[PDB]
Amino acid sequence: MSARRTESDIQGFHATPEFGGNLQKVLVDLIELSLQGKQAHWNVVGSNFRDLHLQLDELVDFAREGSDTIAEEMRALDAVPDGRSDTVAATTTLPEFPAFERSTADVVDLITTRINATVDTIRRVHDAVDAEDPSTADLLHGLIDGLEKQAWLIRSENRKV
């Protein structure tokens, strides 16, 4: 027992309300992106339907894994996620996805914008998150990178060169 600590209830790292609130911002935009991604996935029609249909599902998978990661990171640090529909709708920073069928070209533009807005949210909270907890900032880096890849893979469809 020469180097053993004797404490009996050694506590874990707890997030400040500011940190919790910052992760909460990331969470709602990821959930909203997931819902908008499926909406697009179902309702996309026209030239190169299948590619975008499939790519959109891949986007949804990434955003769903991301939201779960963020929420669980909140839980680990004693924060309480709110991913309920009312909260997501009232607090998301993403512009609303339109109703009805939309062309591949329009879906490409719309979805790219909503991905970009989601990355924006993460980049906006990044420094405050990093300052409090360097480990959580790494999760943010993974999210930024995966989302920016999705953005590139989707937007390239509409590129005119």
Residues of span 4-63 touching a second copy by CB under 8 A: 4-13, 31-32, 35-36, 38-39, 42-55
First-to-last CA distance in the chain? 69
Which one of Fe ion, Mg ion, a second copy, none interacts with residue 15, CB within 5 to 8 A by kind?
A: none
- DSSP readout, 50-94? HHHHHHHHHHHHHHHHHHHHHHHHHHHTT------HHHHHHH--S
Among 68, 124, 128, 132, binds a second copy (CB under 8 A): 68
51 vs 148 by CB, closer to Mg ion = 51
Q: By CB under 5 A, is residue 58 in contact with Fe ion?
A: no
- Give me the least distance between CB of 77 and a second copy, in Å please: 7
Q: 8: which DSSP letter?
A: S
141 binds, among a second copy, Fe ion, Mg ion, none (CB under 5 to 8 A by kind): a second copy
By CB under 5 A, tell whether 51 contacts Mg ion: yes
Number of residues in contact with Mg ion under rule CB under 5 A: 2
The answer on whether 73 is annotated among ligand-binding residues is: no
Residue type (1 letter), 67:
S
Breaks, C-N > 2.5 A, in the chain lie after: none
Per the annotation, binding residues for Fe(2+) are 41, 57, 68, 72, 138
Per the annotation, binding residues for Mg(2+) are 48, 51, 138
